[PDB]
Short mmCIF file of C-alpha atoms and ligand atoms in Angstrom, two decimals:
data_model
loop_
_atom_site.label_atom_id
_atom_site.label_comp_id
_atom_site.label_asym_id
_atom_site.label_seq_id
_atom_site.Cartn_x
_atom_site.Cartn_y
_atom_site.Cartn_z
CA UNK A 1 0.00 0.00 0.00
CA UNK A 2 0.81 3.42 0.74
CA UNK A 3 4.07 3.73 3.39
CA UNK A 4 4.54 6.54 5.24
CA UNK A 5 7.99 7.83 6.46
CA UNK A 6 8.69 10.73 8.38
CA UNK A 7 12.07 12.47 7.92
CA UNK A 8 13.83 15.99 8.82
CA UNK A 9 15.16 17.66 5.86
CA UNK A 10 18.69 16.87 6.83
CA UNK A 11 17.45 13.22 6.52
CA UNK A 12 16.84 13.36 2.83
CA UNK A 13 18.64 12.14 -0.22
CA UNK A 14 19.09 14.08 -2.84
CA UNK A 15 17.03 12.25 -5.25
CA UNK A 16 14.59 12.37 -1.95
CA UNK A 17 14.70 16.41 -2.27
CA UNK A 18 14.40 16.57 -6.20
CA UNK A 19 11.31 14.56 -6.00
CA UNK A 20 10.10 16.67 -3.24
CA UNK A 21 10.59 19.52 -5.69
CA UNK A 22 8.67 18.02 -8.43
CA UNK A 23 6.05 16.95 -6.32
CA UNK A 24 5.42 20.05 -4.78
CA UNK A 25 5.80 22.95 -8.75
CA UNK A 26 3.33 19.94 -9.92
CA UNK A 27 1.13 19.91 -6.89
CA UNK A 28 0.68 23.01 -6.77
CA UNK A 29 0.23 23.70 -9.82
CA UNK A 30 3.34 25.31 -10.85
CA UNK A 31 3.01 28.38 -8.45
CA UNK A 32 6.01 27.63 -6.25
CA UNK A 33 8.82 29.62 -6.26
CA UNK A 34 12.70 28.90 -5.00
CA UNK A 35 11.64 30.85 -1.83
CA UNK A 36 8.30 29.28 -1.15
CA UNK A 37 10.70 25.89 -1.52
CA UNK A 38 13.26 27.28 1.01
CA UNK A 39 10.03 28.42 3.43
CA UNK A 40 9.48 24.48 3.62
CA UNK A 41 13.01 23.52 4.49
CA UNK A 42 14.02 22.74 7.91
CA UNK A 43 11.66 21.02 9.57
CA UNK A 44 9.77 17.65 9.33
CA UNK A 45 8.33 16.01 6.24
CA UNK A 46 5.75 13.76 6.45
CA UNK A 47 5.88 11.33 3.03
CA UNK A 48 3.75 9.20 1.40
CA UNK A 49 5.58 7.10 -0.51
CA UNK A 50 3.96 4.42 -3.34
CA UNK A 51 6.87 1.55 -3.61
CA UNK A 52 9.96 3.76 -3.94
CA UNK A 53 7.56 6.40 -5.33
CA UNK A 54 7.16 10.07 -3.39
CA UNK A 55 3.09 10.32 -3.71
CA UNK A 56 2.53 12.42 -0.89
CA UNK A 57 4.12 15.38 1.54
CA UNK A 58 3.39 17.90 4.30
CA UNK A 59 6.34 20.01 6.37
CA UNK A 60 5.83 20.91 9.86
CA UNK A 61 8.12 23.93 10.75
CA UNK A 62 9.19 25.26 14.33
CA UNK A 63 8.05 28.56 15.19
CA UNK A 64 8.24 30.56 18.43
CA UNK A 65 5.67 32.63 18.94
CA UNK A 66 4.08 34.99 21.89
CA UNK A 67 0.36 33.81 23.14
CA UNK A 68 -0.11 37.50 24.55
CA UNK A 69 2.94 37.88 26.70
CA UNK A 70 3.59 34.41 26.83
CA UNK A 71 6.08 32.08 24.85
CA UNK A 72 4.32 29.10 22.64
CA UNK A 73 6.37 26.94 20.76
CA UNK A 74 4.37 26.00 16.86
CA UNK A 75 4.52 23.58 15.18
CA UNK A 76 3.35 25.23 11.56
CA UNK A 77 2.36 22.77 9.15
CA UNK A 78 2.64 24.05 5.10
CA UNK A 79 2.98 22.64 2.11
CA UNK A 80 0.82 19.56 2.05
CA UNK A 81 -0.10 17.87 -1.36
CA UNK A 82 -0.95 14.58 -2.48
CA UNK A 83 0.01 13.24 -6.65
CA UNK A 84 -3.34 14.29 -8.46
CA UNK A 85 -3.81 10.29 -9.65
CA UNK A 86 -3.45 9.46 -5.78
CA UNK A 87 -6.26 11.65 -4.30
CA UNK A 88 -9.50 11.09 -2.61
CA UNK A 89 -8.00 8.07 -1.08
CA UNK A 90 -7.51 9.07 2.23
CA UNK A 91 -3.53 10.24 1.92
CA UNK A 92 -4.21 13.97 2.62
CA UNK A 93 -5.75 12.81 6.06
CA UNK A 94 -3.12 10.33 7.15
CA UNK A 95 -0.83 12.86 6.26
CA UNK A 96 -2.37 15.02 8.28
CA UNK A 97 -2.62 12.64 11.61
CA UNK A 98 1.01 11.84 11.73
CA UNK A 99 1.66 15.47 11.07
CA UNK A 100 -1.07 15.60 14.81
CA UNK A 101 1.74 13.25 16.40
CA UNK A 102 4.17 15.12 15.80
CA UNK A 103 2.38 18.47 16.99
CA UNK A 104 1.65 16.19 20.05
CA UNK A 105 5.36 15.10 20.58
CA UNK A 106 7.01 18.69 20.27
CA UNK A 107 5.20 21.62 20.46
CA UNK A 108 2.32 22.98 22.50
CA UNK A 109 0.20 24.29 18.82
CA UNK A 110 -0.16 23.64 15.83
CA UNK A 111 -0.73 26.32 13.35
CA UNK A 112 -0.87 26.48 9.73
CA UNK A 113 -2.81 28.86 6.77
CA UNK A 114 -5.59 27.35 4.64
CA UNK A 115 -8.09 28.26 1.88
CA UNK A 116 -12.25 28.69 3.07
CA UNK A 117 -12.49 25.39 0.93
CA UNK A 118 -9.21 24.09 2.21
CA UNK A 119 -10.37 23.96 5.70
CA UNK A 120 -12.72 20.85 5.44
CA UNK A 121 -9.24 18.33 5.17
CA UNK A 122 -7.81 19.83 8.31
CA UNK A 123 -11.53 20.09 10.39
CA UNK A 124 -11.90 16.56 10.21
CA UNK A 125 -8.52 15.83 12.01
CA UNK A 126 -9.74 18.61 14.86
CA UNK A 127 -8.48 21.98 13.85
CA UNK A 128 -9.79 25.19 14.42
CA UNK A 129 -9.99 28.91 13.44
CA UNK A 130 -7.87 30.70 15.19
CA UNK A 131 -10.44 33.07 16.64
CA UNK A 132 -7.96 35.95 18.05
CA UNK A 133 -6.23 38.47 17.18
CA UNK A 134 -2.93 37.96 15.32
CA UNK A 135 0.25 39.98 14.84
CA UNK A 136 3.12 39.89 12.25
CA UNK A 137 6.41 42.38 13.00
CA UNK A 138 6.69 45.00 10.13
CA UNK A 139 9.56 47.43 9.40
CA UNK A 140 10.63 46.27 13.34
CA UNK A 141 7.12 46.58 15.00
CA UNK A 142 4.14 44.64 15.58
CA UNK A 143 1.34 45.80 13.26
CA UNK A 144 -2.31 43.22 13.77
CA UNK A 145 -2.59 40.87 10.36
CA UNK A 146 -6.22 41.49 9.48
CA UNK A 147 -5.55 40.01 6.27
CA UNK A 148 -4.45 36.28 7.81
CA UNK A 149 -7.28 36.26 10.55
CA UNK A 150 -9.87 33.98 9.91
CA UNK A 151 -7.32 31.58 7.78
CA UNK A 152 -5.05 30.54 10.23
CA UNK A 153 -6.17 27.00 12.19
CA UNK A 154 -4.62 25.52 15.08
CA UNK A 155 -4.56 22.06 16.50
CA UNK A 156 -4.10 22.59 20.47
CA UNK A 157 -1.52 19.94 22.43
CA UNK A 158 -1.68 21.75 25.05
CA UNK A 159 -4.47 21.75 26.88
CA UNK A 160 -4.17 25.23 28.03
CA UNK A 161 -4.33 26.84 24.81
CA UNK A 162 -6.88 29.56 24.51
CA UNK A 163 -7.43 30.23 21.13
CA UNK A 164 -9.45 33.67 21.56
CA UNK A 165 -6.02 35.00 22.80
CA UNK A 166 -3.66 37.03 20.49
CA UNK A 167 -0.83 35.20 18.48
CA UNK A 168 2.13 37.40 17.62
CA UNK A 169 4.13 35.27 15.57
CA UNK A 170 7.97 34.94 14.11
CA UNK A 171 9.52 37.03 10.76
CA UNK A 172 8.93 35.09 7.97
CA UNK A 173 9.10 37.57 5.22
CA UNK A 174 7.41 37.30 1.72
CA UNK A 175 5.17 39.85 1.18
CA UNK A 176 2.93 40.72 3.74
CA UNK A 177 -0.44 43.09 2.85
CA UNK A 178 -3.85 43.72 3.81
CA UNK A 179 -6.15 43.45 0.48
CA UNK A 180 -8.54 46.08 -0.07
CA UNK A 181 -11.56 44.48 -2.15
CA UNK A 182 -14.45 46.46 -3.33
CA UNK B 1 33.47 2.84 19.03
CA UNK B 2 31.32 5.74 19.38
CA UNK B 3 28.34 5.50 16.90
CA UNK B 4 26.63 9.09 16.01
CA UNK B 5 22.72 9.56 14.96
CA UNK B 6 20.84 12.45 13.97
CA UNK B 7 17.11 11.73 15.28
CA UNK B 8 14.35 14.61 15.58
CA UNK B 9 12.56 14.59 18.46
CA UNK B 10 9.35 13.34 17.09
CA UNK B 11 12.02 9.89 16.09
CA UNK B 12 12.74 9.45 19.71
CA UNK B 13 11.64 6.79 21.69
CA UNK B 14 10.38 6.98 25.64
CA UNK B 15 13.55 5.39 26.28
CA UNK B 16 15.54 7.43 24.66
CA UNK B 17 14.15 10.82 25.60
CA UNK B 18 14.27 9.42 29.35
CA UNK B 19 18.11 9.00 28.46
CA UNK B 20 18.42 11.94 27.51
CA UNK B 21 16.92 13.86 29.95
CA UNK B 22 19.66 11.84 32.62
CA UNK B 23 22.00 12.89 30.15
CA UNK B 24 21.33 16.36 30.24
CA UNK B 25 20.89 16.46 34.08
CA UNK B 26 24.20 15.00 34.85
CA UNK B 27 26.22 16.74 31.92
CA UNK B 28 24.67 20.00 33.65
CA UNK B 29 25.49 19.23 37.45
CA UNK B 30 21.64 19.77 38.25
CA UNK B 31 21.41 22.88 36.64
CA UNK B 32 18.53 21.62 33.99
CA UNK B 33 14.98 22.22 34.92
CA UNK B 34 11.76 21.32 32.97
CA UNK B 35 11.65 24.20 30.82
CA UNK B 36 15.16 23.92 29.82
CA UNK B 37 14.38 20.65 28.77
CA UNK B 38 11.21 21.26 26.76
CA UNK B 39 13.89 24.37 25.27
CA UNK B 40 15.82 21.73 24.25
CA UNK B 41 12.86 19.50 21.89
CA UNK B 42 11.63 20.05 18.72
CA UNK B 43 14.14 20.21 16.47
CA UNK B 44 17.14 17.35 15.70
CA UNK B 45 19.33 16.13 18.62
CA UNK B 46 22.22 15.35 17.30
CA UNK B 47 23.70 11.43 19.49
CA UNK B 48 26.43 9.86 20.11
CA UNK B 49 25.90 6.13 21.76
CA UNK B 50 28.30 3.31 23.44
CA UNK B 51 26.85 0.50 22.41
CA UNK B 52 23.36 1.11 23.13
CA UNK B 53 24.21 3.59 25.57
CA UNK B 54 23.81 7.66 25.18
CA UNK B 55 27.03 9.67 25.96
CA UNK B 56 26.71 12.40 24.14
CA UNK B 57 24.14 15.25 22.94
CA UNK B 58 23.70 18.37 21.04
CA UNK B 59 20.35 19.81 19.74
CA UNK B 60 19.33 22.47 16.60
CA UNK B 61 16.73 24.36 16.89
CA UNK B 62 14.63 26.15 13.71
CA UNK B 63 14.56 29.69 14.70
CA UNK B 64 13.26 32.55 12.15
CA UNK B 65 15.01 35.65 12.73
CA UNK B 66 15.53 39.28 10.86
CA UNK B 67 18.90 40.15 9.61
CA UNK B 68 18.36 44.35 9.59
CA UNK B 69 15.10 43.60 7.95
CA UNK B 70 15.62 40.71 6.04
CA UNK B 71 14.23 36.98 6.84
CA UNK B 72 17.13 35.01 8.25
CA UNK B 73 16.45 31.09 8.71
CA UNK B 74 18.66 29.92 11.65
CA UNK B 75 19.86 26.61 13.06
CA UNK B 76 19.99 27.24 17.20
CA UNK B 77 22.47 25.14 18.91
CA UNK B 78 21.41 24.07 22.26
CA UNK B 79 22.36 21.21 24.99
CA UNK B 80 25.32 19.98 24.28
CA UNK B 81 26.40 17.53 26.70
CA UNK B 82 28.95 15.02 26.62
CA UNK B 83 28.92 12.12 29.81
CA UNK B 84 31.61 12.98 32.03
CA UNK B 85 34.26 10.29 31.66
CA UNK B 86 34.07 10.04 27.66
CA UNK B 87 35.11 13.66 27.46
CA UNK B 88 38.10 14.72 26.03
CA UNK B 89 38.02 12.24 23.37
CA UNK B 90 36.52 14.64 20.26
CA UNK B 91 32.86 13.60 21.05
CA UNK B 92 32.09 17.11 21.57
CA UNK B 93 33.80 17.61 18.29
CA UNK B 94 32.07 15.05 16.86
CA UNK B 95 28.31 16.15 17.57
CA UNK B 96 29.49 19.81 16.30
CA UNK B 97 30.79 18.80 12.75
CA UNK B 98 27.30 16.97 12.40
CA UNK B 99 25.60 19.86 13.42
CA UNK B 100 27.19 21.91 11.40
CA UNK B 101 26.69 19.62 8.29
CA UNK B 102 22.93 19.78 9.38
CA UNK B 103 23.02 23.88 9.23
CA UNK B 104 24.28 23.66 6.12
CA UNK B 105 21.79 21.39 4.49
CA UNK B 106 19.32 23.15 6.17
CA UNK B 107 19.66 26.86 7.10
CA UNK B 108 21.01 29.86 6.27
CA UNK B 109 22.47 30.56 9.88
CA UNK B 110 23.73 28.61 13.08
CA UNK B 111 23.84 30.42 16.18
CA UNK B 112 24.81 29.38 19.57
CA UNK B 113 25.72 31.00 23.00
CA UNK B 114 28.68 30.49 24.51
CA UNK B 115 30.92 31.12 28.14
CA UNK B 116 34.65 32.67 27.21
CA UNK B 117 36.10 29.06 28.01
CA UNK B 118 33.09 27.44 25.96
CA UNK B 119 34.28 29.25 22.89
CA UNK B 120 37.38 27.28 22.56
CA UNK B 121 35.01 23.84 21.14
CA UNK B 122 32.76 26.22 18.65
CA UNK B 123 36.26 28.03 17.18
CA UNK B 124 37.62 24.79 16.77
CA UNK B 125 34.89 24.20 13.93
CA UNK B 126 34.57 27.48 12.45
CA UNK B 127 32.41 29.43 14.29
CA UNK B 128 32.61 33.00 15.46
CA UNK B 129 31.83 35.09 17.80
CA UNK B 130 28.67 37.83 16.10
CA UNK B 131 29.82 41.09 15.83
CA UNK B 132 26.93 43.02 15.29
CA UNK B 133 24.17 43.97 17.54
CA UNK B 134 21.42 41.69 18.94
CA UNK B 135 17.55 42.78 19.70
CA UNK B 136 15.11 40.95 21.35
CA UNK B 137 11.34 41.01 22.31
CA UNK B 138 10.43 42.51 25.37
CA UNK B 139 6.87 43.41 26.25
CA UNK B 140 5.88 43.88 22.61
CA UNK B 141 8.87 45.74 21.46
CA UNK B 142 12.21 45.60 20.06
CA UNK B 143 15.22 46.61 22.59
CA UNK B 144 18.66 45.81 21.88
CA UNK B 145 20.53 42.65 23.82
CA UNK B 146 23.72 44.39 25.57
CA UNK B 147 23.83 40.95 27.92
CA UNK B 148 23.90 38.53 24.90
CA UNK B 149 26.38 40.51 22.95
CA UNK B 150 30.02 38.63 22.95
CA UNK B 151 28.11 35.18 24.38
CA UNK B 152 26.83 34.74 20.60
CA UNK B 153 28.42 32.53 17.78
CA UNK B 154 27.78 31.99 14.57
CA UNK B 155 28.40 30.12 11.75
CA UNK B 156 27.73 30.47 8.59
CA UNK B 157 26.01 28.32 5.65
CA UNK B 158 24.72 31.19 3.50
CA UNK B 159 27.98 32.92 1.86
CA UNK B 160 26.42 36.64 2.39
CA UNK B 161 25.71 36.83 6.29
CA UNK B 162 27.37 40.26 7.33
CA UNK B 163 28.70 38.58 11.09
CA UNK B 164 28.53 43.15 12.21
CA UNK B 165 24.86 43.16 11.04
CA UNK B 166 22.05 43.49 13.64
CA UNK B 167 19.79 40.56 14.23
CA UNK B 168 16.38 40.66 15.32
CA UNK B 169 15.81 37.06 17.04
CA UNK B 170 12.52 35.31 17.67
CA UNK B 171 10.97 35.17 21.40
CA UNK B 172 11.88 32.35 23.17
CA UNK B 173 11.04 33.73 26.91
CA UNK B 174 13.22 32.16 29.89
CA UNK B 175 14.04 35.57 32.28
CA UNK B 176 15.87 38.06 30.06
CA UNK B 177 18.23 40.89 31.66
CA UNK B 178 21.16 42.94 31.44
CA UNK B 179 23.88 42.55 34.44
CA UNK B 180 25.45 45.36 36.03
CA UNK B 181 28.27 44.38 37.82
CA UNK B 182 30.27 46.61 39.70
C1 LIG C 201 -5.59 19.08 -0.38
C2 LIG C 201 -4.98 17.75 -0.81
C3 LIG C 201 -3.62 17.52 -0.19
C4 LIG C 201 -5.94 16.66 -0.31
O1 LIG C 201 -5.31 15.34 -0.52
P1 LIG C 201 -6.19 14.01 -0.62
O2 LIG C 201 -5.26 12.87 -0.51
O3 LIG C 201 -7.10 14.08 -1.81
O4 LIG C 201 -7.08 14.11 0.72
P2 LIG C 201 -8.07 13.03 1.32
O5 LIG C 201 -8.33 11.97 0.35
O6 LIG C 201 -7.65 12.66 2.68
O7 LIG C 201 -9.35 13.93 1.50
C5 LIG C 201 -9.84 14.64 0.33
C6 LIG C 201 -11.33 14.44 0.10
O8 LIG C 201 -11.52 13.12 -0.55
C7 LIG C 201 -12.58 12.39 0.17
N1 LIG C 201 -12.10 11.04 0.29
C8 LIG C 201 -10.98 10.65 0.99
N2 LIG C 201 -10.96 9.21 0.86
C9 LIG C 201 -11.97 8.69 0.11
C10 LIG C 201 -12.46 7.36 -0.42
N3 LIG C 201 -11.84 6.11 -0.15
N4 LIG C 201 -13.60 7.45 -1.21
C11 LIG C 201 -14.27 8.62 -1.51
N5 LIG C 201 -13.86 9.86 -1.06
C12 LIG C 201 -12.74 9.97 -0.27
C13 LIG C 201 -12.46 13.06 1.58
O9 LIG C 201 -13.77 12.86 1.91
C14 LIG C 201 -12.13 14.52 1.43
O10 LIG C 201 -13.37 15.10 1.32
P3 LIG C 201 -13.82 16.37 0.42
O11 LIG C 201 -14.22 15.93 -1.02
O12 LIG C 201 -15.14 16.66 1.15
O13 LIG C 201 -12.83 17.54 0.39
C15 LIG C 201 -4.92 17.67 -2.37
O14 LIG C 201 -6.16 18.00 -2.97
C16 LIG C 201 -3.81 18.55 -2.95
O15 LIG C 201 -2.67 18.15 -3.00
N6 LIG C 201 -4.18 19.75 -3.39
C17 LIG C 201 -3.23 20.71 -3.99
C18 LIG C 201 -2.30 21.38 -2.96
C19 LIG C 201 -2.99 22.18 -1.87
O16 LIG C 201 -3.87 22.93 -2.15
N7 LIG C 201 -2.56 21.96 -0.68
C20 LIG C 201 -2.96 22.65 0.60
C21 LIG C 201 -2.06 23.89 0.99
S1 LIG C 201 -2.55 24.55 2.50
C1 LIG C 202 31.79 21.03 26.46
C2 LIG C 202 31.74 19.51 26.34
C3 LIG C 202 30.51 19.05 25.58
C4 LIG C 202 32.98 19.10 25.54
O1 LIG C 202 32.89 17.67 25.21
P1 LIG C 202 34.20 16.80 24.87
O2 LIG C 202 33.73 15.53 24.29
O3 LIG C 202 35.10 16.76 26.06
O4 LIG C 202 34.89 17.71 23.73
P2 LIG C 202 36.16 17.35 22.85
O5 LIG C 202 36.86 16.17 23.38
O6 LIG C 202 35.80 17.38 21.42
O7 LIG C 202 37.01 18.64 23.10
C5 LIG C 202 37.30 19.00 24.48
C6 LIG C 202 38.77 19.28 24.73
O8 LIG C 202 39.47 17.98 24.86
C7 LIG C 202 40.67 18.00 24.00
N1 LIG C 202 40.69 16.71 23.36
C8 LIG C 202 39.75 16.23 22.49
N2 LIG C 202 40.25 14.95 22.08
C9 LIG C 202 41.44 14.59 22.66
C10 LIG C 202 42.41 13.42 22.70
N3 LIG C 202 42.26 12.23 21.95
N4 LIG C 202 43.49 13.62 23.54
C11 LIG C 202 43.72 14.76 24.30
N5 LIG C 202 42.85 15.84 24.31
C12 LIG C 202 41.71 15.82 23.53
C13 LIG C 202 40.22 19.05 22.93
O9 LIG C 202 41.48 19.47 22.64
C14 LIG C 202 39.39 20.13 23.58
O10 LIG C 202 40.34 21.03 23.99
P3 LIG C 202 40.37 21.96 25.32
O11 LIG C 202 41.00 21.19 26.52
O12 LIG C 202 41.45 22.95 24.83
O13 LIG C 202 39.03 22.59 25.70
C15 LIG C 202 31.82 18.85 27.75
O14 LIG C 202 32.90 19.36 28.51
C16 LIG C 202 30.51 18.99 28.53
O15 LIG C 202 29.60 18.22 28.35
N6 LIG C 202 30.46 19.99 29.40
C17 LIG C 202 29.28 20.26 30.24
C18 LIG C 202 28.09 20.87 29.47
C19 LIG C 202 28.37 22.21 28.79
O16 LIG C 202 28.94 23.07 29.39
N7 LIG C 202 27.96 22.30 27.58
C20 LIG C 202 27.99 23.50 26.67
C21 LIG C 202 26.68 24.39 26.70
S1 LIG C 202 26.80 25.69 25.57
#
């Protein structure tokens, strides 16, 4: 069937890394830059492999963030996709419960960034809308991300995680705006 | 002889974490309390083992920093420990030249603090003391390190870090002050 391995980036091969490439420009449908590839390096990657094949991937990054005045450590989980032929099968959601375990193991929140439609996957494995405030730094300062709130879930390990409370999170550059729609 | 691994902490077993955690104790003379050792978890822990025994530790950390006001990707070097009677054998050595293979594969930056005696190690391998000036949170706001300054290494994977620029480092909390000693 489908095996799963989970495996730092320092753990991967080289042809282990070129497929992850591949599998992420054609998974995402060719919008993925040489930054947004860097922005998932570093961390853990969860892979769904098909005999030697790479069918599946999500990266959970550390982040230290502030829960008000507070320190939280995050566990922020990007870059999840699943080979086109291989979906609807359930991958995307075991994916997405080993990526839980790990959250459970090493961090006291999850956090990642989805879509409106998006959000179903990660629902049905417990996460939530972030209902609080968040901040990002810009130019040095905080400034609150209007734009992000409402798309950010989180997936509490520890219990005492209020998620009404106000996130201020790490620098993680790449353009950062509040769209104006009329 | 002494056999290294590179496990993250999510690849641990009870065992080993409980190993670790004597480790750590020991290799600290008691000065190692709970938060330090969730401060430690996370990221990779870099082993060394006797048979199946753990001597030796050293853990990286993901931080996300600013470099003046760019994004800076950092590898955190944290915990290192060797067992008392293995030192002075290279093991510390050892579990540094794996870490820094790790920043390199991996991040742009590896940072560490250091004592004046602890420096020795860390020069050995190539790292150097920062330069520049260091900020960190407090209450909200940016407010430059004085303590930190000199206690900070780096070394460096991407070829255009500026070691005199100012970084801007992620919250991590534990009891942050400046010393005035007279
Ligand atoms: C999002 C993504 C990873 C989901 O992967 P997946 O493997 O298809 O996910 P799953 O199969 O676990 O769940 C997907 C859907 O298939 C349905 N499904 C899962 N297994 C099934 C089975 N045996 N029979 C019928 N339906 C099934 C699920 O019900 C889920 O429901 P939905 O139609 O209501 O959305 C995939 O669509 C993808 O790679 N998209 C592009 C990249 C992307 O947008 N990533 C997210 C960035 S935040
Ligand atoms: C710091 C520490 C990890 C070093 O571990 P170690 O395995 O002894 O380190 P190494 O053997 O690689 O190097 C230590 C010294 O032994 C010397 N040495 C290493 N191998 C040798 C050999 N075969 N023969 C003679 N001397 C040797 C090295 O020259 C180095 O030089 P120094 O005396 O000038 O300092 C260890 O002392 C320790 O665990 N200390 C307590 C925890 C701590 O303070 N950690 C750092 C937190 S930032």
């Amino acid at each position: 069937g489908i095996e799963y391995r989970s495996l730092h980036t320092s753990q991967l091969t080289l042809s282990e890394k070129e497929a992850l490439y591949d599998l992420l420009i054609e998974g995402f449908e060719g919008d993925f830059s040489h930054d947004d590839f860097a922005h998932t390096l570093g961390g853990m990657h969860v892979m769904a492999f098909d005999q030697q094949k790479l069918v599946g991937h999500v990266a959970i990054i550390q982040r230290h963030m502030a829960l008000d005045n507070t320190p939280i450590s995050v566990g922020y989980v990007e870059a999840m996709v699943v080979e086109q032929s291989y979906r609807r099968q359930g991958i995307g959601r075991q994916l997405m419960l080993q990526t839980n375990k790990i959250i459970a193991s090493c961090y006291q929140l999850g956090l990642l960034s989805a879509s409106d439609d998006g959000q179903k996957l990660y629902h049905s494995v417990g996460w939530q809308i972030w209902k609080g405030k968040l901040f990002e730094l810009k130019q040095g300062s905080y400034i609150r991300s209007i734009e992000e709130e409402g798309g950010v879930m989180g997936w509490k390990a520890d219990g005492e995680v209020d998620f009404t409370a106000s996130l201020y999170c790490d620098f993680r550059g790449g353009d950062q705006w509040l769209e104006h729609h009329h």
